[PDB]
């Protein structure tokens, strides 16, 4: 009764089909799948012991698009205007990605990854990479803050620059913990001097 | 009167004995395992244990210890009770009847005598001569054995040594001679007497006192070739025959004190060791001829935390633990590239020591949910605990990887599905499923090399398979396909549905709808959505013509469970729902009323809806949570009415009882799909699928109570549920080392964020502390917040206070230094958890350890170490102080309900105090003056208070009807012989009054409920019948057991009925109730008891 099955062709189609898919998502490039067709391959053709190498492969994959990323933010200019609306942008770009890739990897997460705390989250290994390529350990860093303690502080005097883009950069920040490790303080300092200024002034 | 029904709703589980022998034949070898009261017996299979008989002790099982007296064929069993109930048990196998008969017992309680520290010790002579018990300090009970006693009548001999630390019978003696290790000024020594049960007193031992290590606490009689003992200390194992003296210091065990150890040989060649930090060691006694050349240990691995480990056979070793789950591990004879021998085999679920515990109603149902902090330093753990449904497995079949299941009646007369599909990754493999028989036979018209989204039995005799590329309409009789439609661009169906008339499949972004007609497949709908199809439902439910008049639908990038009406394609309404997660599944079904459906999101949310027959509109949107995993929804016809399954990590089944929803957890690891079948074989069966293997059986209406488990790998302290938060604060504690470094990675330090305590207030191996904010859906650490140095989180509560709207964790610490015996310092902490992070919103250093918070009444109620004192939550958002009460030794347990406040002492033992608001402050209503310890305290009324000693009693208290109007009454009084740490109100559960649930160190979890007079007298009267029936193990009285019991004080039983005792009415034979019920009728009690089982 019931002669086994070959499994040969499922496991080698697939990697190739894994590193498409995270390129099509990636720069949104265009999918024929309408992506269910895709999260019922990721259900399908991943299985025990599946999944870890699976991850090494995903991940690789989308951490060189968030290396490719890197080089427009590697810069020269000095716009707060303007560079921190690239940041911005990207950081959408990032978050629909990763978010739709969630919706195909989800499977991982309600299997290995959501039902086994070994790893950064999808979320978490996204995050890690877009901070560490391009807002920690770079210009952009110290250029951001400058810029948005411009952008506040000529806020802190009159007009109203972008409500959006203030509370953006600063949803950046605070989920980077570049809200709540050492960047608070930039905000703080400026605030103590330049409102020290304001108070003995109009005193 | 108080009147009290006491039950247990889990026995205990922490292991406090075991002991291998052949016990229940001369051939058997037997595991028979002191679980607190409960006696488990196994046979050692070469795999595993077999369960054979599990008895109630009417004691906790002090000693437990198998012996042969000369010409007895097999093992008799002598077990000695914490109150002192000596027996010798005795197995009888009589065909299927089984019996544990006494074949003696007695009660050896001396009048007076300090209990001796290290604790009951009782010893057999190894040529079974006598029983040495040391019950007292300076005493050595000793209970002849040749004298064939009934009675166990024993004699002291009086001990000259006060402070004997452990005790063993050595071995190739001609007279019993015992070793024992003692502790006098001048440090330990070893020492040895020869027992004259003639003389009845000792005589000069073999080899005498010598000097041995300061922290020497374990001795080890060495079986007859060797002879001698082997003394086990902290730094040193030393080894004593008289001249010879081998000594070794193995560095690897100063790490940790080696507790428990068994003798792995009969010569005594090799032992296990287990320590208090799980490490396993072998020590090797290497034989010279024969003499003791030298002396080895070598670690094995890491196990649980052993209290007594046995090794069985065949590398097989028992490691029962109290602190952790029991462990059946193997000992391989080579390492595993790990440097450890030991690889588990199977664990017992062991609820460790309960130290605190919540009553959730998670997953929004009707049904109360434990989560306990249970275990300790390295197997401390989250147990969540709930009543649940289970069936038997009756056909398995072991196919790797199945993604599908349907019934299908290939037999065309009957209505029965004598057929099983399955779909596995690109091809459908079938089953005959033959009577019970399986093995897979074809069906013609179905094809082996495509997947299969669906297959099924359809109308005009017909059946149908859907697969990833086109459909499949067999006529069941005549032969195979005269119906097959196809995409016109051949692209492969990505989401399917079908009914038993029509189907409906969708192709990427647009929709198909094709019905069925007799030898034909005739297609009719389509549309053009805007993004794919994640899910579909076209059943007919209440049809009554002949098709469905409806249809839902879950898109991508716009998550919404929308629906169509059928004939159209058209938006009858479209529901977001949120969250980048796109629905894997969604039904609709009828559930007694109308149409409901039930759409999921892929980690466990689950909304369910009323549905109309001619709007189809959705309302009623309400959520609930139920797994991780994405889930899959098919129903199964019951007897009575559709019954909704949900396929994930916890598979639940879905149901309403009298018209409100209820949401049963099923007590199987997983499944992956399910499929109604009613085989001949097999009726209304289930058929459910998991990674490896096809189960198949049926619903089962008892309960089963589910424990999952949250490994902490550190030990939790407390636990409390903020419901606006969705998460579970928990106070956890892990042991570093040296500035320090963490031992193994704890759930602590394995958060997704974390943060440490700065604060301005206050400026070997280490406690640090840290508060666990966990999920509780995930039950993964969301955030762990480490406290001050030298600080210990030892009270939390989780409230809103004063006004203000946020609800906040509040932990109240000490600065514990060794320099001192209780601390001086310490501070209450007001954190708050949102966006994921915990924010320190307040603090206030208080003078002393914050044993206990309640919240009360919007303020803040808490008991630094003497005192007693209320805050309120100031606008300016800080606790400041509004009373304060002092006439507490220490205010160790605090409850509450409504003006009034119940302190348990450390040995006061009560306090009923009441926060007069009209003026402010404090008044002492009642007192207890008895001097009890207390373990826990709750308010079962307004004028009841249960209590629990550290004597294993529980009493309830009440404030009675002038200045005797300040005491206490104790009106209730019970020996429950577990230790309480917990009381909480709630049930498990969807005649008594009130429901307490309780948590102990053993495991136990009870429930105390209030009986009216007239139930109480009417089961009081049954429980003199069954204790007049019902016969105990070792010939215990049950008023005796239940007697409360303490060091200086005795009293019966009263306002308290064992549960467990009438709940055994029902399992004994009709003759025997009648003796129960001689002067109403039988079958009355009976659903009486079966009443008061409805309660846990």
Same mark, same amino acid.
């Given at each position: 009764?019931?002669?086994?099955?070959?499994?040969?062709?499922?496991?080698?189609?697939?990697?190739?089909?894994?590193?498409?898919?995270?390129?099509?998502?990636?720069?949104?490039?265009?999918?024929?799948?309408?992506?269910?067709?895709?999260?019922?391959?990721?259900?399908?053709?991943?299985?025990?012991?599946?999944?870890?190498?699976?991850?090494?492969?995903?991940?690789?994959?989308?951490?060189?698009?968030?290396?490719?990323?890197?080089?427009?933010?590697?810069?020269?200019?000095?716009?707060?205007?303007?560079?921190?609306?690239?940041?911005?942008?990207?950081?959408?770009?990032?978050?629909?990605?990763?978010?739709?890739?969630?919706? &195909?990897?989800?499977?991982?997460?309600?299997?290995?990854?959501?039902?086994?705390?070994?790893?950064?989250?999808?979320?978490?290994? +996204?995050?890690?990479?877009?901070?560490?390529?391009?807002?920690?350990?770079?210009?952009?860093?110290?250029?951001? &803050?400058?810029?948005?303690?411009?952008?506040?502080?000529?806020?802190?005097? +009159?007009?109203?620059?972008?409500?959006?883009?203030?509370?953006?950069?600063?949803?950046?920040?605070?989920?980077?913990?570049?809200?709540?490790?050492?960047?608070?303080?930039?905000?703080?300092?400026?605030?103590?001097?330049?409102?020290?200024?304001? +108070?003995?002034?109009?005193? | 009167?108080?009147?009290?029904?006491?039950?247990?709703? #889990?026995?205990?589980?922490?292991?406090?004995?075991?002991?291998?022998?052949?016990?229940?034949?001369?051939?058997?070898? /037997?595991? !028979?395992?002191?679980?607190?009261?409960?006696?488990?017996?196994?046979?050692?299979?070469?795999?595993?244990?077999?369960?054979?008989?599990?008895?109630?002790?009417?004691?906790?099982?002090?000693?437990?210890?198998?012996?042969?007296?000369?010409?007895?064929?097999?093992?008799?069993?002598?077990?000695?009770?914490?109150?002192?109930?000596?027996?010798?048990?005795?197995?009888? #196998?009589?065909?299927?009847?089984?019996?544990?008969?006494?074949?003696?017992?007695?009660?050896?309680?001396?009048?007076?005598?300090?209990?001796?520290?290290?604790?009951?010790?009782?010893?057999?002579?190894?040529?079974?001569?006598?029983?040495?018990?040391?019950?007292?300090?300076?005493?050595?009970?000793?209970?002849?054995?040749?004298?064939?006693?009934?009675?166990?009548?024993?004699?002291?001999?009086?001990?000259?040594?006060?402070?004997?630390?452990?005790?063993?019978?050595?071995?190739?003696?001609?007279?019993?001679?015992?070793?024992?290790?003692?502790?006098?000024?001048?440090?330990?020594?070893?020492?040895?007497?020869?027992?004259?049960?003639?003389?009845?007193?000792?005589?000069?031992?073999?080899?005498?006192?010598?000097?041995?290590?300061?922290?020497?606490?374990?001795?080890?009689?060495?079986?007859?070739?060797?002879?001698?003992?082997?003394?086990?200390?902290?730094?040193?194992?030393?080894?004593?025959?008289?001249?010879?003296?081998?000594?070794?210091?193995?560095?690897?065990?100063?790490?940790?004190?080696?507790?428990?150890?068994?003798?792995?040989?009969?010569?005594?060649?090799?032992?296990?060791?287990?320590?208090?930090?799980?490490?396993?060691?072998?020590?090797?006694?290497?034989?010279?001829?024969?003499?003791?050349?030298?002396?080895?240990?070598?670690?094995?691995?890491?196990?649980?935390?052993?209290? @007594?480990?046995?090794?069985?056979?065949?590398?097989?070793?028992?490691?029962?633990?109290?602190?952790?789950?029991?462990?059946?591990?193997?000992?391989?004879?080579?390492?595993?590239?790990?440097?450890?021998?030991?690889?588990?085999?199977?664990?017992?679920?062991?609820?460790?020591?309960?130290?605190?515990?919540?009553?959730?109603?998670?997953?929004?149902?009707?049904?109360?949910?434990?989560?306990?902090?249970?275990?300790?330093?390295?197997?401390?753990?989250?147990?969540?605990?709930?009543?649940?449904?289970?069936?038997?497995?009756?056909?398995?079949?072991?196919?790797?990887?199945?993604?599908? !299941?349907?019934?299908?009646?290939?037999?065309?007369?009957?209505?029965?599905?004598?057929?099983?599909?399955?779909?596995?990754?690109?091809?459908?493999?079938? !089953?005959?499923?033959?009577?019970?028989?399986?093995?897979?036979?074809?069906?013609?018209?179905?094809?082996?090399?495509?997947?299969?989204?669906?297959?099924?039995?359809?109308?005009?005799?017909?059946?149908?398979?859907?697969?990833?590329?086109?459909?499949?309409?067999?006529? #069941?009789?005549?032969?195979?396909?005269?119906?097959?439609?196809?995409?016109?661009?051949?692209?492969?169906?990505?989401?399917?549905?079908?009914?038993?008339?029509?189907?409906?499949?969708?192709?990427?972004?647009?929709?198909?709808?094709?019905?069925? *007609?007799?030898?034909?497949?005739?297609?009719?709908? *389509?549309?053009?959505?805007?993004?794919?199809?994640?899910?579909?439902?076209?059943?007919?439910?209440?049809?009554?013509?002949?098709?469905?008049?409806? @249809?839902?639908?879950?898109?991508?990038?716009?998550?919404?469970?929308?629906? !169509?009406?059928?004939?159209?394609?058209?938006?009858?309404?479209?529901?977001?729902?949120?969250?980048?997660?796109?629905?894997?599944?969604?039904?609709?079904?009828?559930?007694?009323?109308?149409?409901?459906?039930?759409?999921?999101?892929?980690?466990?949310?689950?909304?369910?809806?009323?549905?109309?027959?001619?709007?189809?509109?959705?309302?009623?949107?309400?959520?609930?949570?139920?797994?991780?995993?994405?889930?899959?929804?098919?129903?199964?016809?019951?007897?009575?009415?559709?019954?909704?399954?949900? @396929?994930?990590?916890?598979?639940?089944?879905?149901?309403?009882?009298?018209?409100?929803?209820?949401?049963?957890?099923?007590?199987?690891?997983?499944?992956?799909?399910?499929?109604?079948?009613?085989?001949?074989?097999?009726?209304?069966?289930?058929?459910?699928?998991?990674?490896?293997?096809?189960?198949?059986?049926?619903?089962?209406?008892?309960?089963?109570?589910?424990?999952?488990?949250?490994?902490?790998?550190?030990?939790?302290?407390?636990? @409390?549920?903020?419901?606006?938060?969705?998460?579970?604060?928990?106070?956890?504690?892990?042991?570093?080392?040296?500035?320090?470094?963490?031992?193994?990675?704890?759930?602590?330090?394995?958060?997704?964020?974390?943060?440490?305590?700065?604060?301005?207030?206050?400026?070997?191996?280490?406690?640090?502390?840290?508060?666990?904010?966990?999920?509780?859906?995930?039950?993964?650490?969301?955030?762990?917040?480490?406290?001050?140095?030298?600080?210990?989180?030892?009270?939390?509560?989780?409230?809103?206070?004063?006004?203000?709207?946020?609800?906040?964790?509040?932990?109240?610490?000490?600065?514990?230094?060794?320099?001192?015996?209780?601390?001086?310092?310490?501070?209450?902490?007001?954190?708050?958890?949102?966006?994921?992070?915990?924010?320190?919103?307040?603090?206030?250093?208080?003078?002393?350890?914050?044993?206990?918070?309640?919240?009360?009444?919007?303020?803040?109620?808490?008991?630094?170490?003497?005192?007693?004192?209320?805050?309120?939550?100031?606008?300016?958002?800080?606790?400041?102080?509004?009373?304060?009460?002092? /006439?507490?030794?220490?205010?160790?347990?605090?409850?509450?309900?409504?003006?009034?406040?119940?302190?348990?002492?450390?040995?006061?033992?009560?306090?009923?105090?009441?926060?007069?608001?009209?003026?402010?402050?404090?008044?002492?209503?009642?007192?207890?003056?008895?001097?009890?310890?207390?373990?826990?305290?709750?308010?079962?009324?307004?004028?009841?208070?249960?209590?629990?000693?550290?004597?294993?009693?529980?009493?309830?208290?009440?404030?009675?009807?002038?200045?005797?109007?300040?005491?206490?009454?104790?009106?209730?009084?019970?020996?429950?012989?577990?230790?309480?740490?917990?009381?909480?109100?709630?049930?498990?559960?969807?005649?008594?009054?009130?429901?307490?649930?309780?948590?102990?160190? /053993?495991?136990?979890?009870?429930?105390?409920?209030?009986?009216?007079?007239?139930?109480?007298?009417?089961?009081?009267?049954?429980? /003199?019948?069954?204790?007049?029936?019902?016969?105990?193990?070792?010939?215990?009285? *049950?008023?005796?057991?239940?007697?409360? *019991?303490?060091?200086?004080?005795?009293?019966?039983?009263?306002?308290?009925?064992?549960?467990?005792?009438?709940?055994?009415?029902?399992?004994?034979?009709?003759?025997?109730?009648?003796?129960?019920?001689?002067?109403?009728?039988?079958?009355?009690?009976?659903?009486?008891?079966?009443?008061?089982?409805?309660?846990?």
């Amino acid at each position: 009764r019931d002669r086994p099955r070959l499994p040969d062709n499922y496991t080698q189609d697939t990697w190739r089909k894994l590193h498409e898919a995270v390129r099509a998502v990636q720069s949104s490039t265009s999918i024929r799948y309408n992506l269910e067709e895709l999260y019922q391959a990721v259900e399908n053709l991943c299985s025990h012991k599946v999944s870890p190498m699976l991850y090494k492969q995903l991940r690789q994959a989308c951490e060189d698009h968030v290396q490719a990323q890197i080089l427009p933010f590697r810069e020269d200019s000095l716009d707060s205007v303007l560079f921190l609306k690239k940041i911005n942008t990207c950081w959408q770009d990032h978050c629909r990605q990763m978010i739709m890739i969630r919706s &195909i990897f989800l499977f991982l997460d309600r299997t290995y990854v959501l039902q086994n705390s070994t790893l950064p989250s999808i979320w978490d290994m +996204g995050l890690e990479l877009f901070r560490t390529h391009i807002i920690s350990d770079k210009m952009v860093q110290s250029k951001t &803050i400058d810029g948005i303690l411009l952008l506040i502080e000529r806020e802190r005097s +009159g007009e109203a620059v972008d409500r959006s883009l203030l509370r953006s950069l600063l949803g950046m920040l605070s989920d980077l913990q570049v809200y709540k490790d050492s960047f608070e303080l930039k905000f703080l300092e400026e605030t103590n001097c330049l409102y020290a200024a304001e +108070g003995q002034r109009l005193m | 009167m108080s009147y009290n029904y006491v039950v247990t709703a #889990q026995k205990p589980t922490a292991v406090n004995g075991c002991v291998t022998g052949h016990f229940t034949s001369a051939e058997d070898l /037997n595991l !028979l395992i002191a679980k607190n009261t409960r006696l488990e017996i196994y046979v050692v299979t070469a795999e595993g244990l077999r369960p054979v008989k599990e008895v109630g002790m009417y004691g906790k099982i002090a000693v437990m210890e198998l012996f042969r007296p000369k010409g007895e064929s097999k093992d008799l069993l002598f077990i000695l009770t914490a109150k002192y109930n000596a027996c010798i048990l005795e197995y009888k #196998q009589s065909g299927e009847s089984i019996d544990i008969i006494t074949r003696a017992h007695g009660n050896v309680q001396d009048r007076i005598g300090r209990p001796s520290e290290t604790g009951i010790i009782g010893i057999i002579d190894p040529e079974c001569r006598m029983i040495g018990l040391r019950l007292y300090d300076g005493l050595f009970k000793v209970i002849p054995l040749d004298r064939d006693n009934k009675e166990l009548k024993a004699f002291n001999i009086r001990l000259e040594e006060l402070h004997v630390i452990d005790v063993k019978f050595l071995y190739g003696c001609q007279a019993p001679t015992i070793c024992f290790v003692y502790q006098d000024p001048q440090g330990r020594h070893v020492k040895t007497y020869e027992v004259s049960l003639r003389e009845k007193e000792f005589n000069k031992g073999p080899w005498k006192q010598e000097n041995v290590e300061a922290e020497a606490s374990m001795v080890i009689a060495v079986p007859e070739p060797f002879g001698g003992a082997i003394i086990i200390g902290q730094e040193s194992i030393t080894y004593h025959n008289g001249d010879k003296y081998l000594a070794i210091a193995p560095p690897i065990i100063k790490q940790s004190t080696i507790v428990c150890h068994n003798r792995v040989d009969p010569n005594g060649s090799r032992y296990l060791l287990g320590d208090m930090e799980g490490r396993l060691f072998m020590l090797l006694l290497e034989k010279e001829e024969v003499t003791l050349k030298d002396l080895r240990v070598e670690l094995l691995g890491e196990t649980s935390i052993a209290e @007594c480990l046995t090794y069985l056979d065949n590398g097989v070793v028992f490691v029962g633990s109290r602190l952790g789950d029991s462990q059946l591990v193997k000992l391989n004879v080579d390492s595993n590239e790990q440097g450890s021998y030991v690889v588990a085999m199977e664990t017992f679920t062991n609820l460790g020591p309960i130290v605190d515990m919540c009553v959730v109603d998670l997953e929004r149902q009707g049904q109360g949910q434990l989560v306990t902090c249970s275990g300790a330093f390295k197997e401390g753990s989250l147990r969540i605990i709930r009543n649940g449904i289970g069936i038997h497995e009756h056909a398995s079949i072991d196919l790797p990887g199945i993604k599908g !299941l349907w019934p299908l009646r290939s037999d065309p007369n009957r209505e029965t599905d004598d057929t099983l599909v399955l779909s596995f990754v690109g091809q459908t493999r079938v !089953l005959m499923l033959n009577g019970e028989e399986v093995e897979e036979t074809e069906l013609m018209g179905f094809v082996d090399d495509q997947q299969t989204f669906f297959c099924g039995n359809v109308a005009h005799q017909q059946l149908i398979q859907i697969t990833s590329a086109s459909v499949r309409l067999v006529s #069941q009789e005549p032969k195979a396909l005269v119906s097959e439609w196809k995409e016109p661009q051949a692209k492969n169906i990505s989401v399917a549905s079908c009914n038993s008339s029509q189907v409906v499949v969708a192709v990427g972004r647009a929709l198909y709808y094709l019905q069925i *007609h007799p030898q034909e497949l005739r297609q009719i709908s *389509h549309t053009e959505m805007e993004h794919e199809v994640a899910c579909l439902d076209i059943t007919p439910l209440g049809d009554s013509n002949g098709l469905s008049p409806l @249809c839902a639908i879950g898109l991508w990038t716009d998550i919404s469970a929308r629906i !169509l009406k059928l004939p159209s394609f058209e938006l009858l309404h479209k529901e977001m729902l949120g969250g980048e997660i796109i629905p894997r599944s969604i039904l609709m079904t009828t559930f007694e009323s109308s149409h409901y459906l039930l759409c999921a999101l892929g980690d466990g949310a689950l909304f369910y809806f009323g549905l109309n027959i001619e709007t189809g509109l959705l309302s009623d949107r309400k959520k609930v949570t139920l797994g991780t995993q994405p889930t899959v929804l098919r129903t199964f016809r019951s007897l009575s009415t559709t019954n909704v399954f949900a @396929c994930s990590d916890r598979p639940t089944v879905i149901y309403s009882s009298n018209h409100k929803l209820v949401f049963s957890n099923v007590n199987l690891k997983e499944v992956n799909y399910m499929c109604p079948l009613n085989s001949d074989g097999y009726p209304d069966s289930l058929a459910l699928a998991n990674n490896s293997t096809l189960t198949i059986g049926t619903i089962d209406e008892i309960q089963k109570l589910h424990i999952r488990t949250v490994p902490l790998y550190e030990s939790p302290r407390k636990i @409390c549920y903020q419901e606006v938060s969705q998460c579970f604060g928990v106070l956890s504690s892990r042991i570093e080392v040296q500035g320090t470094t963490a031992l193994r990675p704890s759930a602590s330090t394995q958060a997704l964020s974390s943060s440490v305590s700065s604060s301005k207030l206050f400026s070997e191996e280490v406690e640090v502390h840290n508060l666990l904010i966990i999920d509780q859906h995930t039950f993964e650490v969301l955030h762990a917040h480490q406290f001050l140095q030298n600080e210990y989180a030892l009270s939390l509560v989780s409230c809103k206070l004063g006004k203000d709207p946020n609800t906040y964790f509040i932990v109240g610490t000490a600065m514990v230094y060794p320099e001192e015996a209780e601390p001086k310092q310490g501070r209450i902490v007001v954190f708050q958890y949102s966006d994921g992070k915990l924010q320190t919103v307040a603090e206030k250093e208080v003078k002393g350890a914050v044993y206990s918070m309640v919240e009360f009444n919007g303020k803040l109620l808490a008991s630094i170490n003497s005192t007693v004192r209320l805050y309120e939550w100031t606008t300016e958002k800080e606790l400041r102080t509004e009373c304060n009460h002092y /006439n507490n030794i220490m205010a160790l347990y605090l409850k509450t309900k409504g003006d009034f406040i119940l302190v348990g002492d450390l040995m006061r033992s009560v306090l009923l105090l009441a926060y007069k608001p009209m003026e402010g402050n404090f008044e002492e209503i009642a007192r207890d003056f008895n001097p009890n310890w207390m373990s826990a305290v709750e308010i079962l009324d307004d004028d009841n208070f249960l209590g629990a000693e550290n004597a294993f009693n529980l009493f309830v208290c009440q404030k009675d009807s002038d200045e005797e109007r300040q005491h206490l009454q104790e009106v209730g009084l019970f020996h429950l012989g577990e230790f309480v740490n917990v009381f909480c109100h709630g049930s498990l559960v969807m005649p008594t009054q009130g429901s307490v649930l309780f948590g102990t160190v /053993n495991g136990m979890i009870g429930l105390v409920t209030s009986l009216s007079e007239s139930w109480y007298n009417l089961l009081l009267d049954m429980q /003199n019948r069954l204790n007049k029936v019902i016969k105990s193990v070792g010939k215990i009285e *049950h008023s005796f057991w239940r007697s409360f *019991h303490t060091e200086r004080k005795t009293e019966p039983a009263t306002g308290f009925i064992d549960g467990d005792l009438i709940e055994s009415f029902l399992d004994i034979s009709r003759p025997k109730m009648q003796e129960v019920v001689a002067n109403a009728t039988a079958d009355d009690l009976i659903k009486v008891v079966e009443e008061l089982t409805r309660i846990h």
